[PDB]
Design a protein around this ligand. Structure first.
Ligand SMILES: COc1nccnc1C(C)C
Ligand code: NA
Ligand code: NA
Ligand code: NA
Length: 157
C-alpha cells in the first residue's frame, strides 16, 4: 500500500527509522552537485508528535560530517518546514513505507527559490523500476532527468 503525507490515509509513524539517499533532483542542479549544500545523505528519520528529526551526513573531500535537523509540522497536513540554508517546506508525495520514500521540497533563500526532490530507500539502493517511478514524479514537477542525480554508488562513508 502507498500513501502521500498530504493524503487522509497517511501514517507518519510508518516512515520512522532507517533511510538512505538514493537519488536527488533539483531545478537548480548546483544545489545537489559535489559541493552543494543540499547533497545530503539521509540516515534516519525519527518521528515525533509534531516533528521529524532528520539525521544526515554530508561529504567534503571524501570526508563525512554528521548533520541533524528538526522539521516541524506546519498548518497544512503532511507538510513540514525546516530552517537550513534558507527556509524549506516539504511534503512526501509518495511512499510505500517499506521500500521507498519520495520527498518534494521548496527552498527559499535571499528572495529566490528552487525545487528539490529526493528518493530515499530502506536499503542503500532501490530497484530500477522504483527509480523510474521517481523520474516520472520529477517530470510531473518540471525537473528534467539531466537534473536527477543517482547517488547510490556514493551514499556510504
Ligand atoms: C533539508 O532537507 C533535505 N535536503 C536534502 C535532501 N533531503 C532533504 C529532506 C527532504 C529529507
Ligand atoms: Na503552501
Ligand atoms: Na506535488
Ligand atoms: Na509539493
Amino acid at each position: 500500500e502507498e500513501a502521500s503525507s498530504t493524503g487522509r490515509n497517511f501514517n507518519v509513524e510508518k516512515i520512522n527509522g532507517e533511510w538512505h539517499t538514493i537519488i536527488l533532483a533539483s531545478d537548480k542542479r548546483e544545489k545537489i552537485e559535489d559541493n552543494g549544500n543540499f547533497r545530503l545523505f539521509l540516515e534516519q528519520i525519527h518521528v515525533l508528535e509534531k516533528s521529524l528529526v532528520l539525521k544526515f551526513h554530508t561529504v567534503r573531500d571524501e570526508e563525512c560530517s554528521e548533520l541533524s535537523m528538526v522539521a516541524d509540522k506546519t498548518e497544512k497536513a503532511g507538510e513540514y518546514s525546516v530552517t537550513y540554508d534558507g527556509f524549506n517546506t516539504f511534503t512526501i508525495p509518495k511512499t510505500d513505507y517499506d521500500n521507498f520514500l519520495m520527498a518534494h521540497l521548496i527552498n527559499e533563500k535571499d528572495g529566490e527559490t528552487f525545487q528539490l526532490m529526493g528518493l530515499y530507500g530502506r536499503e542503500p539502493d532501490l530497484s530500477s523500476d522504483i527509480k523510474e517511478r521517481f523520474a516520472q514524479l520529477c517530470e510531473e514537477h518540471g525537473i528534467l532527468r539531466e537534473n536527477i542525480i543517482d547517488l547510490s554508488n556514493a551514499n556510504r562513508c
